[PDB]
A paper describes a structure:
The reaction center (RC) and light-harvesting complex 1 (LH1) form a RC–LH1 core supercomplex that is vital for the primary reactions of photosynthesis in purple phototrophic bacteria. The RC–LH1 supercomplex comprises an RC surrounded by the LH1 ring that is made of multiple αβ-heterodimers. In contrast, some Rhodobacter species, such as Rba. sphaeroides, possess dimeric RC–LH1 core structures, representing the largest photosynthetic complex in anoxygenic phototrophs.
Cryo-EM single-particle analysis determined two distinct classes of RC–LH1 dimers (Class-1 and Class-2) at 2.74 Å and 2.90 Å resolution, respectively. Consequently, the continuous S-shaped LH1 array fractures in the middle, resulting in two separated C-shaped LH1 rings with a narrower opening (~20 Å) in the LH1 array than that of the Class-1 dimer. In contrast, the continuity of the array of excitonically coupled BChls is interrupted at the monomer–monomer interface in the Class-2 dimer, resulting in a ~23-Å gap between adjacent BChls from the two monomers. In Class-2, differences in the RC–LH1 association occur at the dimerization interface, and the two N-terminal heads of PufX are further separated, due to the twist of two RC–LH1 monomers, compared with those in Class-1. In contrast, the N-terminal domain of PufX (Ala2-Pro15) is not resolved in the structures of the monomer and Class-2 dimer, presumably due to its disordered structure when not binding with RC-H and LH1-1 subunits of the neighboring monomer. Moreover, a putative UQ-10 (QY) that associates with PufY and is close to the RC QB site was identified in the cryo-EM maps of the Class-2 dimer and WT monomer, whereas it was not visible in the Class-1 dimer. The head group of QY is located near the cytoplasmic side and is sandwiched by the aromatic rings of RC-M Trp41 and PufY Phe7 via π–π interactions, forming a quinone-binding pocket.
Numbering used by the authors:
A (entry chain Y): 2 to 52
B (entry chain L): 1 to 281
C (entry chain 7): 1 to 48
D (entry chain 9), H (entry chain I): 1 to 54
E (entry chain A), F (entry chain D), G (entry chain F): 1 to 55
I (entry chain H): 1 to 258
J (entry chain X): 17 to 68
K (entry chain 8), M (entry chain B): 6 to 49
Amino acid sequence: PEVSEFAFRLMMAAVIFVGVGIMFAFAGGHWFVGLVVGGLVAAFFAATPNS
Amino acid sequence: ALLSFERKYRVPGGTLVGGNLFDFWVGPFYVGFFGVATFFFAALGIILIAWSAVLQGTWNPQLISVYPPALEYGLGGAPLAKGGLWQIITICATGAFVSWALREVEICRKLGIGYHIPFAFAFAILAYLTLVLFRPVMMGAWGYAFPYGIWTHLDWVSNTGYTYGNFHYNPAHMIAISFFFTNALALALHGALVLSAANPEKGKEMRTPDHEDTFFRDLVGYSIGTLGIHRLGLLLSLSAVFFSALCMIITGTIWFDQWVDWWQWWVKLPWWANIPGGING
Amino acid sequence: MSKFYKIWMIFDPRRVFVAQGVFLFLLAVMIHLILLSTPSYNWLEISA
Amino acid sequence: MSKFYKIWMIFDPRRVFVAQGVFLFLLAVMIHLILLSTPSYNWLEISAAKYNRV
Amino acid sequence: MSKFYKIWMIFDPRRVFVAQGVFLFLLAVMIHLILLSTPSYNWLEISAAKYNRVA
Amino acid sequence: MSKFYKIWMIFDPRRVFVAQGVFLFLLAVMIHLILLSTPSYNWLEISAAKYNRVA
Amino acid sequence: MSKFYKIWMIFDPRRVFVAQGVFLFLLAVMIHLILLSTPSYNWLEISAAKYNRVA
Amino acid sequence: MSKFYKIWMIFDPRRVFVAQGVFLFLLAVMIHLILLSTPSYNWLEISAAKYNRV
Amino acid sequence: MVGVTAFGNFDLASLAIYSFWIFLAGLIYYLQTENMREGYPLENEDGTPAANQGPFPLPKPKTFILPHGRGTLTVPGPESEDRPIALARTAVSEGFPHAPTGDPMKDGVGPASWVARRDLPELDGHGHNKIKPMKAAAGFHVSAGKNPIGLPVRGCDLEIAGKVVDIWVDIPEQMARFLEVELKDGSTRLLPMQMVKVQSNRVHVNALSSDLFAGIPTIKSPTEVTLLEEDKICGYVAGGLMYAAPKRKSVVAAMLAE
Amino acid sequence: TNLRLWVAFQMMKGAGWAGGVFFGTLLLIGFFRVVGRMLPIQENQAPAPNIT
Amino acid sequence: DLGYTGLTDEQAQELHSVYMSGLWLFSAVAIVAHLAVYIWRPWF
Amino acid sequence: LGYTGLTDEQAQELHSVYMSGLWLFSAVAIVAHLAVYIWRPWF
Amino acid sequence: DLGYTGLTDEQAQELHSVYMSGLWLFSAVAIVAHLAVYIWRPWF
Amino acid sequence: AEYQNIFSQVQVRGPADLGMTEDVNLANRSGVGPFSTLLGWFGNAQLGPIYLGSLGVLSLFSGLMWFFTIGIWFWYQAGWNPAVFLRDLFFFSLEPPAPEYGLSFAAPLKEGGLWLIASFFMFVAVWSWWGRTYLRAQALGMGKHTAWAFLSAIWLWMVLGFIRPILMGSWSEAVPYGIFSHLDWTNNFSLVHGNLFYNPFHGLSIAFLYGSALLFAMHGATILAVSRFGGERELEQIADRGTAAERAALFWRWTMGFNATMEGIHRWAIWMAVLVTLTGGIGILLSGTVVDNWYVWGQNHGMAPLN
Ligand code: BCL
Ligand SMILES: COC(C)(C)C/C=C/C(C)=C/C=C/C(C)=C/C=C/C(C)=C/C=C/C=C(C)/C=C/C=C(\C)CC/C=C(\C)CCC=C(C)C
Ligand SMILES: COC(C)(C)C/C=C/C(C)=C/C=C/C(C)=C/C=C/C(C)=C/C=C/C=C(C)/C=C/C=C(\C)CC/C=C(\C)CCC=C(C)C
Ligand SMILES: COC(C)(C)C/C=C/C(C)=C/C=C/C(C)=C/C=C/C(C)=C/C=C/C=C(C)/C=C/C=C(\C)CC/C=C(\C)CCC=C(C)C
Ligand SMILES: COC(C)(C)C/C=C/C(C)=C/C=C/C(C)=C/C=C/C(C)=C/C=C/C=C(C)/C=C/C=C(\C)CC/C=C(\C)CCC=C(C)C
Ligand SMILES: COC(C)(C)C/C=C/C(C)=C/C=C/C(C)=C/C=C/C(C)=C/C=C/C=C(C)/C=C/C=C(\C)CC/C=C(\C)CCC=C(C)C
Ligand SMILES: COC(C)(C)C/C=C/C(C)=C/C=C/C(C)=C/C=C/C(C)=C/C=C\C=C(C)\C=C\C=C(/C)CC/C=C(\C)CCC=C(C)C
Ligand SMILES: COC(C)(C)C/C=C/C(C)=C/C=C\C(C)=C\C=C\C(C)=C\C=C\C=C(C)\C=C\C=C(/C)CC/C=C(\C)CCC=C(C)C
Ligand SMILES: [Fe+2]
């Protein structure tokens, strides 16, 4: 109940990764397209924690 | 039996179980509650291996093999002569390992150092429990575990590896092998660098950490630092084990065909699955 | 056996009682599993 | 034999009883598992064949 | 063989007794397991055949 | 050869005796295990054939 | 020839003796294992064939 | 030829002797092992054929 | 040489594998002796050499020529504690814990122990002080993460005992080593960066309680810290983990409390 | 302050910790048993890796 | 009077009597359980 | 000679109590061995 | 009088005398145990 | 749930460290590159400078030409198709000549001749780099431990690609230049030689490869555990033993009975990793040249149940 900014940033990135991955796996014809787009956005989101 | 500086650190406390009941040293070893469990499980495990050699009918240490129960017994008990001993040894081995890790925890608290060492050891145990417990339970047979033999647990590796064709194509395996190779590369570099800085050319002064960073910056243009390399050593080893545990827990549970067949998904991507030329088509 | 009480001046009582509780439970678990291992004495199977 | 009490002048009773407790229980578990392994003296197996539990 | 007591001037009594205890137990366990391996001198197998416990 | 006692002016008796103790035990074990390996000189198997233990 | 004693001015007597003790034992173990491996000179087996220990 | 003693002003006698001793032994092991490998010059088998040991 | 056996099954592969066992046995001996250059010869629990020294003999001494003219260090050598150990034997038989005679954190025994290192600051390759405050450091600044300066310092008892004022930086490695925590009395103590957890709004020091913050050993010079002062500070704080357990409010601390 | 309860409480304390650890271990074993049953292991399963 | 735990002789006697009483109670119940099983399924 | 700090009398009391436990343990073992030998001899 | 262990000669003699008595007791039990085995199953 | 020192919780960025200047020709040394915050969380953030001398140039030129030659063959195998190039990147391979040609250099350029050219570039590249490690240590006056630790790696590398093919009298025994090919070469190596697991020297290398992971996990965790006492500065602990060195000594002394020093642990570290390839080179060298089947060799040496 005392998550830091980095802890919350990672948790949202995992949620974003799963969410966006499913989004572009449906949109694209392959699951890899979701993995790439979901991974890149989550990595970009988790690498920029506001502080 | 004490080092020239050991006395001032030998104080009570830090025990997880037993208090001062087992808080004593046998020679250099610290006993603790979990060391008593360690010695019992270690001694019992060793004897049953020796007794298993009697039942097997061989005394050559390399031919000694404690095979797990056959696939027909599933995940139940087995006769001691045909699998039951392996289950007792595995329970003894599991008890000995976890007691050893928890004994290290007591030594950590007594010395006031971090719990990185028992946490590092716990990764090995979960790697061990993956092969003997987690993977066989998912596959529903103790026979999928490996025998407790020097050269028969290699037969298990070779047989399990070739069940899925060339096991090199396991993607989690490739990650772990790169980590194992990287860790050994880092250890050789790290060990050699400090010795070079501490045992330099004859007559020259003992070098400083700056020479260590200067050497590797003149070599590969980047020095990770004394703190970084030990962080790197810990993470490289744990990642290698974590992916090795992962590689087996997905094999025979999520993937069942040859691992080379898995890699065709990349070739069969929609935008180049049908382009002529190259290796695949 | 009239001086076995003196063992409590050797080993701390509360520490032993906790350890003995662990030992008795694990020993009870040990024997029950061995009985289940044998095809007979396996009460969970012979009933059904 | 009457001087064997001097073993405690050398060995602390706390460590010995811990060492002895482990040793005896290790020894006791060792022998029971040896008997169970052999087809004879496996008293669980002996009664099953004697009373047709199969 | 009269001055063998001087071994205790060289060897610590505590360490030897622990070493001797471990040595004797492991030596005794080794010899018993050697006998059990051979079909003869495996007294567990001997009594089974002598009193016909195989059936 | 009367100056062989001088070996103790060079060799620490404590380390030699432990090394000698381990060496003698391992050497004694090794010769016994070599003898137990051969079909002959395995006194366990010799008695079995002599007294018809294997039947 | 006579001046060979000066080797101890160069070589540490303790280092040589330990190295020599290990060398002699390992060399002796090696040659004995060579003789045991050959069908001849395996004195255990040739005596067994001499008195017909196994037939 | 007569000034070969000078070479000890360049080489440390201890390291040369240790290196020489190891090399001589390892070379001696190698040749004695090579001779055993060939059916000829295997003096153990040579005597066996001569005296009809087998 | 496929199948060429000198005798029995012994062949070139068999030659190599045994020759390695000899090499590995020799190598393990060599490695172990090198490890015996520190802490040896062994001593009894009183301070006299023990009757047991181990199967591996001590190595021939080697000399380390220290940098910056600090002298030489020959090991194995006569090593002394050079400090009174305030510990009391709890049993005449060896292999038993020594209980502290007084306050262990102040007496520097147990987890709070420290070594009589050279009472000089540690130098870089250029002869300057390796560890300096960021204020006296030339150009150093916080580059990433939460800046701990100005944050309240909360002890293991969940009570604020001061605030961070300055950061000490290892100039070659360019990483922070100490936090200079100013207490309520106006003096500033040093806290190792490894023993603090800079949270979003506070510096949580799980090692020490609020009342124990004043007890941290102080530095003789505000601009530099010697090796001896580092050990006393690092020892004291890390000794707080076991010696401030009654004062810690954590759930796991209560479960592991006596 | 009852001595009989105090001794029984200690032994129950140890038995509870051993019980929780043993029950926790069974939970992991049961979890992997459930997951293996859910996954299509029985439909296609590997042969014996070691000689029975 | 070794005093390794600090308990007086009287406390050791009282604790041992408590411990033995529980031991015989535990032994008695185990004997009943063994009788029950041997009646249900003898192992000899 | 002193290693554990026990006096000669304390050792004698300690040994006597220990020996009492040993013979009690041995007696149950002898009873157990007779019971097993009667039920199924191993000689 | 090397005295590596710190024992005096009198202490060594008393320790050895008790140690040999324990050894002869251990040897005596072994000799009986070997007689029992040799009678029941000679290995020569 | 406290600070485990795995990642730095704060970064400080001072001026770039230009390094020591014992005997290093500063003309051949480059300038300081960027500062990486991402790298700063784990280790140092500064990249560069890097020394580039004569052996540095030879290492790069041969290293680039080795990398370039594999790439051109990778493009030719792709038909110069960028889409095919990325699709079959791991499945590309610069195979060595066919077994018929033996050690002869008469192989056609597209049938093994190109591999000889690429292999030559790698050979020069690696050996020139080994001297570079040697000379960089000599320039700063340090020990040659890296040079000989590297030579252990070269021994296995020489054996796989150069020495063993010569003894087998065929370039076909060498290693193809590809991601999946040199994996397939590895698998085909064991199968041809009869379960390379039963190679005693391969087993030893796995022992030291496992041990290197074991020792670095042990050593890395130990120093991070005693990093709260400034134990990461291992060179000062060797010079002046602090409390971290003593606790690190005592933890392993109370755990497994024996310990090491702050300097002697790194002797274990270097020898644990060196034997990985040292025993590896002998293990591969014997295969085929001395043992054509390890499992049959294992049977005759009491490692397998049969025989
Ligand atoms: C089916 C496959 C076979 C098998 C076949 C082989 C073969 C074949 C070999 C090994 C080898 C190895 N095997 Mg095996 N192996 C199998 C099963 C296993 C298992 C297991 C759990 O099953 C394990 C743990 C191992 C483990 C190992 C390693 C211990 C060892 C390699 C050391 C190393 O670092 O090599 C990798 C490191 C190198 C080759 C050194 C490289 C050094 C050079 C100088 C680097 C140059 C860099 C170059 C220029 C690129 C630069 C790039 C730029 C920097 C960007 N094997 C099975 C039985 N294994 C090797 C060995 O030595 O065996 C004895 C070997 O040749
Ligand atoms: C494979 O090859 C095979 C095995 C087939 C053949 C074997 C070949 C080989 C290599 C054989 C090698 C044999 C060797 C080297 C044998 C050597 C044996 C020796 C030298 C044995 C020595 C025995 C000595 C003993 C047991 C001495 C014991 C001493 C005491 C009991 C007294 C100790 C007490 C003392 C000294 C008191 C100290 C005194 C004072 C004043 C303080
Ligand atoms: C492929 O291999 C095969 C087998 C096929 C063929 C082999 C080929 C090869 C490569 C063969 C190589 C042969 C070589 C190089 C042989 C070299 C032989 C030499 C040079 C031998 C020298 C021997 C010298 C000895 C043993 C000297 C001993 C000296 C002493 C014992 C006295 C030393 C003592 C001293 C100096 C006292 C110190 C004095 C003072 C004043 C301090
Ligand atoms: C290999 O394994 C197999 C299974 C094949 C065979 C196993 C063999 C072996 C080695 C077995 C080992 C057996 C051993 C060593 C058994 C030891 C048993 C002992 C000595 C148990 C002691 C029990 C003592 C107890 C439970 C004492 C309890 C005392 C109290 C609770 C305090 C008194 C308070 C009372 C009675 C009031 C309690 C309060 C309430 C509210 C009921
Ligand atoms: C290969 O494996 C097989 C099994 C086939 C063959 C194995 C054979 C072997 C190696 C067998 C080994 C046998 C041995 C050596 C057995 C050892 C037996 C002994 C010596 C047992 C000792 C028992 C002693 C007991 C249980 C003592 C109990 C004492 C007490 C309960 C009282 C303790 C309390 C005291 C002293 C309080 C005193 C305090 C004050 C203050 C006066
Ligand atoms: C694989 O090879 C096989 C197994 C087939 C053949 C085996 C071969 C080999 C290598 C066999 C080896 C046999 C050996 C070395 C046997 C040695 C046995 C010995 C020497 C045993 C020693 C027994 C001594 C005993 C039990 C002494 C007991 C003493 C006491 C209980 C009293 C202790 C109390 C004391 C000393 C009081 C202290 C005094 C004062 C004043 C404080
Ligand atoms: C678009 O991309 C461009 C074209 C710009 C650049 C890209 C290049 C690419 C994609 C490069 C890819 C490289 C890869 C995949 C390299 C993989 C290498 C691997 C996995 C190597 C593994 C093992 C190799 C070994 C062991 C090689 C050993 C070689 C030697 C020991 C040298 C042997 C020396 C010989 C044969 C000399 C013969 C010549 C003469 C004159 C005697
Ligand atoms: C002549 O002998 C009789 C009367 C038995 C003749 C009988 C013959 C026949 C036909 C017998 C029938 C069957 C057989 C073969 C019986 C065999 C029985 C055997 C082999 C019995 C062996 C008993 C051994 C015992 C009770 C050994 C006890 C030894 C200990 C508990 C070791 C204690 C030593 C310690 C703790 C040393 C510790 C010292 C230090 C310093 C740590
Ligand atoms: Fe390090």
